[PDB]
Design a protein around this ligand. Structure first.
Ligand SMILES: O=c1[nH]c2nc(-c3ccccc3)sc2c(=O)n1O
Ligand SMILES: O=c1[nH]c2nc(-c3ccccc3)sc2c(=O)n1O
Ligand SMILES: [Mg+2]
Ligand SMILES: [Mg+2]
Ligand SMILES: [Mg+2]
Ligand SMILES: [Mg+2]
Lengths: 476, 480
């Protein structure tokens, strides 16, 4: 994946022998922003949720630093309860920095669409109709493209389409991936890079908008949320079936994965989880890995293709409309996932858990979790994704961002604090991982099947372990 | 839903105050087949498998009884084992009744496409290209319509498209069918479809649309027929055993009860009779389970139905079948075993001791969850616009009289994996969802001693479907 920026220097990084170009950020580059934002006199930031504040705030702040005349204006829908906070952050109508969504769309040369996935699906026509011809549409995530492609549609051909997507003391910040879907004049690459740099992205990786939404929507159904919830439920049931006390069962699954296993991967990667077990523990690890890799891949492979085909995005869109009454049927908002046995048990463990506790490192649990991680990697790898995307979505974000939430307060605190699309995916696919492990992986172990040494060998020697090291040095 | 038939006589049936039109079959009508099939000199049955043999043989016999000169020719690929099975049934190239699929299609006036869903999705373009102008394409299931619609496509404009779909004895005997006319380019389509159904031996033929057929069918196997029943027995077995119940008593109180006494009860006197047969304390428990499980079940059924109707689910099935083989550097992932887990190992032991004719225990809590699931499926299909005859065949009769007896005999795998690939995939995809929603929501509502939605219960007791079901049971083949 190449790109062409006339403003910024791109640097090469090598990952498992695969060269990726990246662009480093820095407040020292803010002087370069007016060059990057050529032709833009207004940036409209639509929506003020979790990204609205930070993005608008950062964009306005970095542009002032460069002494730019560019106006950062928020547009909010009629009925938004964020008008007040928008004013609190200095974005007001009298200053011309706040207004109605449509009015704001009409006047912006760059439209950053930060509204929810459901809002984008229900409003893309009106957004397109209000945008200036030849302006730029900016997305933090590629859901909309997937929605349009699921209907055989694309964006209007008169607008540029770019994406700056987040992946999560000199050098602080949050890395981003950027994509240029359409570029009507040749400014797209520089406006997306400037947008990333303006946000404080220490690193901006290159991707395609199609790969972003595929990797993102699939990743959250896999190890990030769906799969880890499924395998944790499967093992809790197995361990308790085998007589292990409920609390140690919880600690040997959730506490282990979200704590010591996560921290171990974060520091020294997957190979140091195995190397940290006793000799007897390595053997249990390999039994679990050898039995769990392909079952996990089964579901991951199925989930990826449903996301890439358009089936899953259509399902997400329709699921969202079922949250409200229609066609004479009841409303079915999302329910609670944390009121079952194992999470009521998990509530007891945490009440007396000491601070900075990391739980026991159960070799079997480790083998299952690492098998799932390696299976996700292989699926994305053979589906054509770059190592930066693969690692930054299958390893870093789960062990460094999401798993701490589970360790903190349980599955719901992790899942239901994510996007609606992610919350739906976790509920739809966690049961799938639970069943296949129980029906296949655990049957293989209970058959006393021998260890698949090809898998183990491939695990020990997988190039991704070395790429994960390089990528680790890229984190902020 | 109405249709116009010149050859056959259409009969009216009242179901919960809703009129439907049915066509009575019978050997006595075979004299009418020559006129029903006017314009047809050759019927090409494409495919063997589970339907081909029967359809071909019955059509041949019926046409001979009618003294028709129409030829039934089987279309198959020479490389299939099915080629010799057709010869073993008296279908020979040497006699003009056996040939390659493509040559058979091209020479047929009525093309009966009985190949697998997956083969249909992979070969429809070439089937269309070989069909004669103004010929008739007949389907036994509307999967192909769903596949085309999921791509914004439809059938060719220059052919008629009909369906005769077994809701399944020809030696009341036979299997009832539903029929649909999707395209009718010359006005013969309705009579050929009814002639087709009558010639199969359908005692009664119900009216539907191709769209409603494939929606109700693909959704139904993911609901109570397979996916949901599996998911609820896994959830109920896990709850019972977690509460201290013996493993074998828990298998009996779930699988054996549902597929035995409960199924026989609903089959004989319907859903209200399962309630009436309970103790006054069991009636309480039943209402607790039903009140807590009706809406969680609707949740998943509603989601599954819209996935089937939108095209999402049919495309998922097409892609799943391609993952049965190695590609893109990834392994092949055929379907796995679903019956090697604890509760099905326990089921084997139960059956090794079971007397013959054992119907198992009638656990009131189990009954409430199962009747709630079946009423929730009924509600989704009703709200989505299906007829009562389709709803009852797909949500009540097929389960209790046809599929559940397979689970009773040898466990879930013997029931699930005897069905179509599309159905086997659906079961595995959706069984986990019904288990999780029951456990996360329905069971949580019970353990909170939540109040009983008395409106739900009163609605259950007074639902018009119970009367509709009694009329539909009187239409079942043989006596049952
Ligand atoms: O859809 C998504 N939602 C989402 N939410 C995240 C989150 C929210 C609150 C606190 C910590 C993390 S991270 C993440 C993500 O990656 N994708 O894709
Ligand atoms: O796909 C489907 N497959 C299927 N298989 C059935 C069967 C198979 C073997 C033995 C007895 C019954 S019945 C049925 C059905 O209704 N649908 O839709
Ligand atoms: Mg993401
Ligand atoms: Mg996401
Ligand atoms: Mg069926
Ligand atoms: Mg079917």
């Amino acid at each position: 994946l190449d790109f062409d920026t006339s403003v910024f220097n791109k640097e090469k990084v090598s990952l498992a022998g695969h060269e990726e170009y990246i662009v480093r950020g820095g407040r020292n580059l803010f002087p370069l922003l007016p060059e990057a934002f050529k032709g833009i006199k207004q940036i409209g930031v639509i929506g003020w949720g979790s990204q609205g504040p930070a993005q608008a705030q950062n964009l306005r702040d970095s542009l002032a630093e460069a002494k730019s005349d560019i106006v950062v204006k928020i547009g909010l829908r009629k009925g938004s309860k964020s008008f007040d906070e928008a004013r609190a952050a200095g974005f007001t109508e009298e200053s011309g920095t706040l207004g109605d969504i449509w009015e704001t769309v009409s006047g912006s040369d760059l439209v950053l669409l930060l509204i929810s996935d459901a809002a984008q699906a229900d409003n893309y026509e009106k957004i397109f109709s209000h945008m200036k011809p030849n302006s730029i549409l900016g997305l933090s995530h590629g859901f909309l493209l997937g929605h349009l492609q699921s209907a055989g549609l694309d964006f209007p051909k008169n607008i540029s389409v770019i994406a700056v997507c987040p992946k999560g003391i000199n050098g602080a910040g949050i890395n981003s991936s950027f994509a240029v879907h359409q570029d009507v004049d040749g400014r797209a690459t520089d406006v997306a890079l400037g947008w990333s740099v303006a946000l404080g992205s220490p690193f901006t990786f290159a991707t395609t908008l199609e790969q972003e939404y595929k990797s993102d929507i699939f990743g959250e159904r896999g190890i990030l949320l769906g799969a880890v919830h499924g395998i944790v439920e499967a093992l809790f049931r197995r361990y308790t079936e085998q007589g292990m006390d409920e609390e140690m069962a919880y600690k040997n699954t959730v506490e282990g994965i979200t704590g010591i296993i996560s921290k171990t991967i974060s520091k020294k990667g997957m190979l140091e989880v195995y190397n940290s077990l006793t000799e007897e523990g390595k053997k249990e690890f390999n039994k679990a890995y050898s039995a769990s890799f392909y079952p996990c891949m089964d579901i991951l492979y199925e989930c990826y293709e449903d996301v890439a085909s358009g089936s899953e995005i259509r399902s997400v869109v329709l699921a969202g409309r079922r949250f409200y009454e229609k066609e004479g049927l009841p409303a079915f908002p999302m329910g609670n996932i944390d009121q079952t046995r194992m999470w009521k048990v998990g509530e007891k463990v945490r009440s007396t858990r000491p601070e900075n506790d990391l739980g026991p490192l159960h070799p079997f649990t480790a083998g299952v979790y690492v098998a799932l991680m390696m299976a996700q990697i292989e699926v994305l790898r053979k589906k054509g994704h770059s190592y930066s995307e693969i690692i930054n979505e299958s390893v870093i974000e789960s062990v460094d961002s999401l798993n701490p939430f589970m360790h903190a307060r349980g599955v719901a605190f992790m899942v239901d604090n994510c996007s609606t699309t992610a919350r739906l995916g976790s509920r739809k696919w966690a049961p799938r991982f639970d069943y296949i492990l129980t029906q296949q992986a655990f049957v293989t172990v209970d058959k006393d099947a021998p260890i698949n040494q090809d898998l183990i060998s491939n695990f020990m020697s997988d190039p991704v372990h070395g790429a994960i090291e390089v990528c680790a040095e890229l984190r902020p």
